[PDB]
Write a protein that binds this DNA or RNA. Structure first.
Ligand SMILES: [Cl-]
Ligand code: NA
Ligand code: NA
Ligand code: NA
Ligand code: NA
Ligand code: NA
Length: 1283
RNA sequence: AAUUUCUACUCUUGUAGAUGGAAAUUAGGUGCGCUUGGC
DNA sequence: GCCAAGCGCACCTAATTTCCTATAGGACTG
DNA sequence: CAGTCCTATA
């Protein structure tokens, strides 16, 4: 039966290992003498220049084909609708099939197989497409059919720089196939049209139809937005939101226009933006009238389309010119500063503001658009000035002060500019004083800016800060001048207005200088990057096989446990085999690898037999057999039957499973499969490369059930490596003469002083070349290796005479906090310029300092030029390339192991990650926040790093990365989770994110469990390097992932945190529906009683679940009724003796004590309750709307079981119901058998949603997990278990 | 405070854990500036 | 001061595709 | 006209 250790050797996994390459002997001198590094840098530079030129071909061709597309989209829309309605596997599969059909229909325009075009056009497209993904791209023939474009002389020089080297673009061809492919892939244009943009466009049509049906006037508004923008001029707004127009939204220029219909168009900064549809809808909602509420109740925001793949974006909005150099910015700004001085702008501004002390302020106007900005800059609150003006005007109204009269005053404050005297009279003399202070500060900063000189360059950050500071000062004055109203309606002071307009006009360029300078100064400086090395060999290191060594130039050696890469360059422009000579193992020397590989037999056997041009040519005119002798030890016969099998008139091939699944005749399929497999055996027994391989471990051909099973057993037999000793002198002579470039393959596990555990990656590598792996392959060495040169990129070091400071004190567990660490480090190195702090001096006897005996240099690896080697490997080589039924295999194990524990992993409000481990019945075994791992607080560190990045962006300085810190943290989380998983043999349950540290964590955890090696395990045990665990399903993408990946499960987050762990109770009410006095009374009427319990001091509110249905979320759960309890507000104590108050609630924050507040309410009303009578009829019949609202708010508070206050550290769960045994749950007791806080409660119920999945898998007769967990099923399940 | 590279370290000229590269594309985010509005 | 809808710029981050090849074919060399 | 070696498979 199943075993946990059986989850091994289930599918192949590819990884890349990276190493430094240390040149040996005269290798580096020879490389330098030959100039290989400089010419590879040049070839990389030429590639970077040539790629955008070549992309003109792809972009022009795709755009020309897209302009011809015309499809009927109704069938795809219907398949989308049916899937959305039914949400079944059948309708999902139907939509998937429909998407494939639509992607293919787009694709037929690229390849010229569409009925919608003529034969002549289709043939031209086929001729073009046939040469788009190979070196024919460069001949320029394709240029003749795209337009009148020819290539310039410089373009011809770039093209010629890849003569006999176009396979440098081998990968690029694949990247471009990924653009045109009809497959279901996100890189491709058909996918982009069919699965990204059409659903968006289809939803916009629905949004439009609902909006203009409910509010027909929006039709005219929308049409007028289109006409004002001047786009789609001969298409009505209705047609823009109809399916046939989508055929006109496939090219980027059309997509750009559509998105600007939605989004509008901006001109220069400081001028009015042209509104799009979404802004019009937003403004309509913000009117807050009756129409606004109707619009807001409907979907009211259109969705912009994604870009077309590869296309260049264009905009109708204004684009600033850009500065190009330090001297352009500084000199241009310096000329502007001098103009401002010459124009006496500062002197005039000061004179104007000084005039305000003695001129008539009733003719000085403040812009009503600026009033809240000014209130914020001058007063306590943004609304101080608005409220003061409102109050003053109300006090000037004549007659009765009605509600409409008040509203009129309110609306007038939005519509009219305000004279300065009214503001001063409304707000008082301290507004005047604040006004004077702000003016002086602004003017004084602008003055100091004009007088201060600019730096010589912008190379140093301090120089950038001078520039930014002076720009901030002038922009401040620009903002200040814009406080004043400009409208000609206001009775403006004539001379004051003319002078203000003058200096405003002169201040206008400040805005453009500000934006242009920021756009330049925040650019990332020139950075050193590694580049690929070729040594003038176009096919360098693409394969290791003995037959390709001369042309690929790459070989491997082992000597005394150290590994070496050999590179063999051309000699005087010619390839020349080195022909190393095997010698006895008694001889001093190097072990050279001999690599023997016949790649993927599914393609290589047809390539070398049935698909030969001579075979294909022969079978067009003949039916007799053809015999092959080249590269065969005895002739290989190809019959018409064998040829026809691999070359059917129509797919699928008869020996593929698809022929059996469709045709349904298994006699034909099994015969064809046996005949093909027999043919491969015939081929392999004779082909030069494979004739010597012993294949007798394969089954008789008829016994294989499908071709994938056969190839999965065959391919492992087609790969072998071995070693032969090469004499020392032959290798050293080859390096001495420059015939061999020899590098040690290096990482620090090969350092002389190495003595600890190796990196996992070192273990993969030494495992690969171990005797056991040589005897039977678990790890294969793959071709397509790459070499890089990384120039030095850094210039901080601990020098010999100095001291270093351990981060941990003498006890080797207490870390020194950062500010203390810096102070102590400076102090022990006699660089502290002041007294040691009290706390630092207290720590001083318990620190550990190290004498620097050898220099330790920060970033040392980046301070010199280095060589690097990236080499792919495949682990679990004996398995198939993909698993079959991985999830069912896990579920078979889980059904035989019903005691499998469960690890629940939640993302918290105050915790990055929280884990709860439960046994199979739900008992908590462990629970832990992962904010801190080994006394390092990653939560604090990450929060501090993000604050630093925000401040850096604001200051125009270097933005420090955060992804490396995130990865470092997550690697520690992975280590802990996996260790728990292996120790407990547990399932892991995560939040299904459809319902960022957490999402990246999910991918890293899945990926680790695709191929899990534990470095302490013996190589031959499961989990050791030669037998990795495989506990998750093969990862493809997040989009292509269900709710189970092997031992990992995904569950919906709802009702996992705000749920009572003792009962499964949740707040059943939707509080938005309890909104006025009448609905509050109906709500109270739906409760059986509220009464006081003299025995305990609690109040009991009895609720039947079939009442108050209009106010419920529709989730009746399992229990027919609940006793909701107002707990007596008495002191309780947690496990450590810390007091808390029972029943306390934290509400919007203030502490609330509902039972005490209920008592106070009842005594205010004179309502007798200490006799146990029902309280609700008394409140209802008295009908005091304030008392009834208080009652309802108290009930809502009691039912808010999660209570949080970031200021106090509170985040607890206190249930409003008692459980089976009388207990009202409170996490503040800190009982370690139950959730210790709200986040732990979430992780607990996450795990239990996994338990529900496992229990239903138990009670079923199949191996299929249920897909998803509805909220009612979850609540009924957990409430039934707990009650 | 050393690294294939990342994070955390320093009994240890190095230690513990992690680490699938390269190319290509796309999406999103943060910050700043601005527009019209809401509070 | 916060927020909504939207535009411009700077840079940072993450997801998803492909390949992980010896040999057939034939253009270039001389 | 062969051997070499880049291109593009299957
Ligand atoms: Cl919840
Ligand atoms: Na180590
Ligand atoms: Na990559
Ligand atoms: Na932005
Ligand atoms: Na605004
Ligand atoms: Na904005």
């Amino acid at each position: 039966m199943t075993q946990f250790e059986g989850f091994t050797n289930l599918y192949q996994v590819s990884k890349t290992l990276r190493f430094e390459l240390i040149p040996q002997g005269k290798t580096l001198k020879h490389i330098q003498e030959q100039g290989f590094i400089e010419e590879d840098k040049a070839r990389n530079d030429h590639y970077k220049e040539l790629k955008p030129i070549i992309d003109r071909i792809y972009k022009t061709y795709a755009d020309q084909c897209l302009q011809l597309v015309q499809l009927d989209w109704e069938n795809l829309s219907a398949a989308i609708d049916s899937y959305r309605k039914e949400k079944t596997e059948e309708t999902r599969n139907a939509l998937i099939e429909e998407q494939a059909t639509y992607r293919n229909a787009i694709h037929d325009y690229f390849i010229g197989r569409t009925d919608n075009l003529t034969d002549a056009i289709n043939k031209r497209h086929a001729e073009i497409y046939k040469g788009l993904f190979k070196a024919e791209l460069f001949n320029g023939k394709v240029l003749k059919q795209l337009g009148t474009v020819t290539t310039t002389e410089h373009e011809n020089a770039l093209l010629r720089s890849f003569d006999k080297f176009t396979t440098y673009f081998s990968g690029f061809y694949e990247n471009r196939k990924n653009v045109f492919s009809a497959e279901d892939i996100s890189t491709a244009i058909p996918h982009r049209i069919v699965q990204d943009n059409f659903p968006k466009f289809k939803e916009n049509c629905h949004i439009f139809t609902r909006l203009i049906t409910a509010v027909p006037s929006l039709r005219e508004h929308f049409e007028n937005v289109k006409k004002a923008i001047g786009i789609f001029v001969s298409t009505s707004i209705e047609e823009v939101f109809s399916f046939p127009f989508y055929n006109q939204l496939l090219t980027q220029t059309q997509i750009d226009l559509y998105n600007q219909l939605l989004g509008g168009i901006s001109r220069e900064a400081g001028t009015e933006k042209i509104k799009g549809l979404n802004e019009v809808l937003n403004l309509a909602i913000q009117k807050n009238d009756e129409t606004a509420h109707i619009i807001a109740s409907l979907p009211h925001r259109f969705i912009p389309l994604f870009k077309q793949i590869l296309s260049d974006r264009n905009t109708l909005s204004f684009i600033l010119e850009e500065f190009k150099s330090d001297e352009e910015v500084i000199q241009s700004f310096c000329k502007y500063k001098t103009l401002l001085r010459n124009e006496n702008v500062l002197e005039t501004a000061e004179a104007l503001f000084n005039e305000l002390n003695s001129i008539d302020l009733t003719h000085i106007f403040i812009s009503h658009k600026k009033l809240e900005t000014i209130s914020s800059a001058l007063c306590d609150h943004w609304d101080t000035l608005r409220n003061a003006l409102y109050e003053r005007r109300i006090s000037e109204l004549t007659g009765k002060i009605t509600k409409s009269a008040k509203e009129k005053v309110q609306r007038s404050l939005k519509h009219e500019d305000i004279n300065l005297q009214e503001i001063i009279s409304a707000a008082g003399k301290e507004l005047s004083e604040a006004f004077k202070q702000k003016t002086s500060e602004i003017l004084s900063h602008a003055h100091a800016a004009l007088d201060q000189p600019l730096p010589t360059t912008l190379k140093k950050q301090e120089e950038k800060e001078i520039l930014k500071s002076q720009l901030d000062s002038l922009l401040g004055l620009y903002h200040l001048l814009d406080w004043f109203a400009v409208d000609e309606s206001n009775e403006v002071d004539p001379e004051f207005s003319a002078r203000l307009t003058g200096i405003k006009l002169e201040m206008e360029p400040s805005l453009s200088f500000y934006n242009k300078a920021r756009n330049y100064a925040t650019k990332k400086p020139y950075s050193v990057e590694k580049f690929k090395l070729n040594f003038q060999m176009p096919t360098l290191a693409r394969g290791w096989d003995v037959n390709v060594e001369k042309n690929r130039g790459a070989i491997l050696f082992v000597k005394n446990g150290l590994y070496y890469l050999g590179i063999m360059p051309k000699q005087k422009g010619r390839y020349k085999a080195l022909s190393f000579e095997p010698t006895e193992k008694t001889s001093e020397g190097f072990d050279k690898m001999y690599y023997d590989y016949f790649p993927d037999a599914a393609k290589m056997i047809p390539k070398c037999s049935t698909q030969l041009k001579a075979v294909t040519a022969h079978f067009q005119t003949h039916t007799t057999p053809i015999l092959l002798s080249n590269n065969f030890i005895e002739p290989l016969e190809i019959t018409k039957e064998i040829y026809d099998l691999n070359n059917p008139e129509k797919e699928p091939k008869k020996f593929q499973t698809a022929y059996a699944k469709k045709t349904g005749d298994q006699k034909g399929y099994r015969e064809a499969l046996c005949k093909w497999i027999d043919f491969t055996r015939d081929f392999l027994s004779k082909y030069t490369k494979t004739t010597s391989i012993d294949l007798s471990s394969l089954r008789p051909s008829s016994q294989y059930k499908d071709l994938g099973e056969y190839y999965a057993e065959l391919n492992p037999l087609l790969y072998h490596i071995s070693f032969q000793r090469i004499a020392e002198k032959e290798i050293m002579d080859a390096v001495e003469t420059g015939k061999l470039y020899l590098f040690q393959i290096y990482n620090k596990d090969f350092a002389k002083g190495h003595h600890g555990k190796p990196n996992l990656h070192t273990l993969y590598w030494t495992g690969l070349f171990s005797p056991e792996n040589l005897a039977k392959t678990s790890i294969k060495l793959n071709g397509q290796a790459e070499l890089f040169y990384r120039p030095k990129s850094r210039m901080m070091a601990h020098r010999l005479g100095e001291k270093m400071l351990n981060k941990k004190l003498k006890d080797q567990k207490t870390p020194i906090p950062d500010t203390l660490y810096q102070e102590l480090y400076d102090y022990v190195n006699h660089r502290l310029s002041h007294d040691l702090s009290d706390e630092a001096r207290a720590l001083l006897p318990n620190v550990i300092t190290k004498e620097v005996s050898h220099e330790i240099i920060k970033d040392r690896r980046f301070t010199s030029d280095k060589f690097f080697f990236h080499v792919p490997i495949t682990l679990n080589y004996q398995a198939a390339n993909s698993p079959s039924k991985f999830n069912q295999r896990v579920n078979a194990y889980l059904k035989e192991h019903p005691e499998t524990p469960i690890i629940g992993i939640d993302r918290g409000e105050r915790n990055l990650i929280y884990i709860t481990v439960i046994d199979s019945t739900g008992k908590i075994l462990e629970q832990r926040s992962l904010n801190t791992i080994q006394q390092f607080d990653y939560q604090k560190k990450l929060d501090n790093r993000e604050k630093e990045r925000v401040a850096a962006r604001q200051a125009w300085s270097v933005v420090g990365t955060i992804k490396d810190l995130k990865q470092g943290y997550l690697s520690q989380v992975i280590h802990e989770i996996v260790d728990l998983m292996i120790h407990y043999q547990a399932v892991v349950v995560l939040e299904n994110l459809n319902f960022a540290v957490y999402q990246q964590f999910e991918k890293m955890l899945i990926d680790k469990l695709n191929c899990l090696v534990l470095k302490d395990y013996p190589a031959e045990k499961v989990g050791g390097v030669l037998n990795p665990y495989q506990l998750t399903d093969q990862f493809t993408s997040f989009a292509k992932m269900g709710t189970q990946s092997g031992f990992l499960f995904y569950v919906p987050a709802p009702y996992t945190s705000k749920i009572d762990p003792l009962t499964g109770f949740v707040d059943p009410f939707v509080w938005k529906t309890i909104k006025n006095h009448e609905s509050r009374k109906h709500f109270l009427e739906g409760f059986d009683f509220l009464h006081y319990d003299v025995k305990t001091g609690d109040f009991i509110l009895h609720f039947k679940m079939n009442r108050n249905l209009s106010f419920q979320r529709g989730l009746p759960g399992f229990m027919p009724a609940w006793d909701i309890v107002f707990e007596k507000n008495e002191t309780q104590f947690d496990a450590k003796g810390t007091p808390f108050i029972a029943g306390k609630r934290i509400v919007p924050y203030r502490d609330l004590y509902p039972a005490n507040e209920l008592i106070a309410l009842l005594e205010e009303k004179g309502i007798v309750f200490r006799d146990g009578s029902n309280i609700l009829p008394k409140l209802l019949e008295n009908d005091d709307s304030h008392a009834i609202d208080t009652m309802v708010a108290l009930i809502r508070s009691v039912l808010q079981m999660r209570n949080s206050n970031a200021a106090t550290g509170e985040d607890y769960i206190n249930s409003p119901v008692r459980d089976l045994n009388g207990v009202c749950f409170d996490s503040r007791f800190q009982n370690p058998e139950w959730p210790m806080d709200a986040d732990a409660n979430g992780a607990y119920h996450i795990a239990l949603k996994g338990q529900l999945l496992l229990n239903h898998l138990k009670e079923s007769k199949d191996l299929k997990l249920q897909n998803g967990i509805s909220n009612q099923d979850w609540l009924a399940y957990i409430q039934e278990l707990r009650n």
